[model samples]
Target chain A: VLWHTSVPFAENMSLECVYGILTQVEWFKIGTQQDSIAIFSPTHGMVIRKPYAERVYFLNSTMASNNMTLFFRNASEDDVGYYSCSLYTYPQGTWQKVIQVVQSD
Target chain B: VLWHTSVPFAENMSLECVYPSMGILTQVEWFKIGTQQDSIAIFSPTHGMVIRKPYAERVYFLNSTMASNNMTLFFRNASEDDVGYYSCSLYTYPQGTWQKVIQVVQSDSFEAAVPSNSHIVSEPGKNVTLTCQPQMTWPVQAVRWEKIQPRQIDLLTYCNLVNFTSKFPRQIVSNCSHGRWSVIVIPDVTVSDSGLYRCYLQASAGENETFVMRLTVA
Candidate 1:
């Protein structure tokens, strides 16, 4: 999906997987290379990487989850780029989705 | 901006924003909570409304009762991608900007949820290559590959990887020098590609090797 916004913007990045139970999920920012933005798994709970952990967040609980969204608290122009998510689902396997974010102002 | 947070996602998500403070409602811009806080929907009395792509497909201004003062929104067919915090920035005629933030969260789902004949599980939309090495020094007299579901092995029932210059189907890519057996590369794999596979290698020195593998698109 293609999206546009300005600085000081709070963005919500989404990852959808309704096929089977989600055992693990990860989000990455695509820049020079792939950077880990956040991760959630039954074993590791939830992990928000550097820089992102400052404002970006994902609510966590004791239980495992299938679908998830990464919260961007206050995004600046530096945040504009491509983002992707990988979901590990049972039986059906893993699926990938991507979103392109650009600054409009 | 009033801030509220809760772990949340469901079928449809609706957000509400009422200009509690005084000042004529000049305009309203709705944003999706994220790393790049994206503006998804906008509204203005003089110019109407413009919903952006993605959100434009399923999001709209819901409240019309004194819509100038109330900027509530309705989201249809909301999925996991719609999860996270949301906000509505209200621009007043005689004032600055008044904002409110709300977050969406989803808790984990506690649900009741293998071996190699060399069992190989892979993700969908990936290129899968199967490789093998035998103890033979000479190029094999023949190298044959078979896909299980023998009852009806469908499109890829048989292929050769080493003999007669690695004779293979158009969809298959097989090659080898004086080294081990050529590799079997399956590109752009999907759910339909899941099944059992077997390989047979025949060496001219009265030697043979057998390998069995299973593929699961997980």
Candidate 2:
């Protein structure tokens, strides 16, 4: 659940990942031929790559030990998409995970 | 003069950018105030519209007419999160911009309430149930279940923002029925499950927070 991205529709959906010693984490949503959804970062704060600044958030204040998560409140049908979690680690190495979000009918 | 837009939470709100003359709009852009001002979306003659993330689904750039050069920023569901100062810049020979602020306020149409419950206890490897019922009757928006760890940190388990459940342990159950009552069930509980849990009810007009309950496992 923490490592995977296929999240069921909820009022708020959190995209989570586990990593060691990182400078930053970035979340991106790439739907089927859709516009990119830029979630946020703990280091640089919200970039507002899309209009989700109000609903999508970085869980810096609520993170677990070495895990980071992103929350999307009021998630809906249009939220269905593929999310990419990229962790910027030491030595400029990047770890990536691709997850899908599907809302229930 | 500047125009202000106000709306109830979860309602749609839009800001319009209309030029005095036609074909003068080479570009249009929107921005919100933050640590520093940030661009929200941009529309150009060659590129059309480019919106920032999170707002992809809820916000839109409406180009009503090429003759009038109108670009309106629309929000499908305006929430408290959308409350902020916004400005729209029009690309013209003399470059004109419109500043408008949005304020999203709670409605007075309804209220939310949650009943108190007894502290829950369970045997090792058993199941436990927690229920919350709003005192007032109204259409509910969402119900959330959270576990508070030491230092008052909240770990959210179930949020009914869409109807999706969480996978914390092997299985966890939650539901908000008829917008009146909600329940959360955790199966195969272990000692790690013991903690302070809270149920939050979000109504159409207001929000309700139930008294925290301590769960113990032996």
Worst 10 residues of 1 chain B by lDDT: B161-170
Taking all chains together, each candidate's TM-score versus the true structure is 0.32, 0.30
For all candidates, state DockQ relative to the true structure.
0.01, 0.01
How does model 1 score by TM-score? 0.32
Q: Which stretches of candidate 1 lie over 4 Å from their true place?
A: A1-105, B5-7, B108-218
Summarize candidate 1's per-residue lDDT along A8-97 as a digit string, tens digits.
223553333222467767776655445677877777878777767776766454234444656676566777766666666663444666
Give one digit per residue, the lDDT tens place, for model 1 in B100-200: 66555556421110123587889997899876555444335456554544222212222322112211132555554443345677788888778776666
C-alpha local distance difference test of each model: 0.59, 0.57
Chain B TM-scores across candidates = 0.45, 0.41
The candidate maximizing TM-score is 1
lDDT of 1 at A30: 56
Q: Report how far off residue B109 is in candidate 1 (Å).
A: 9.5
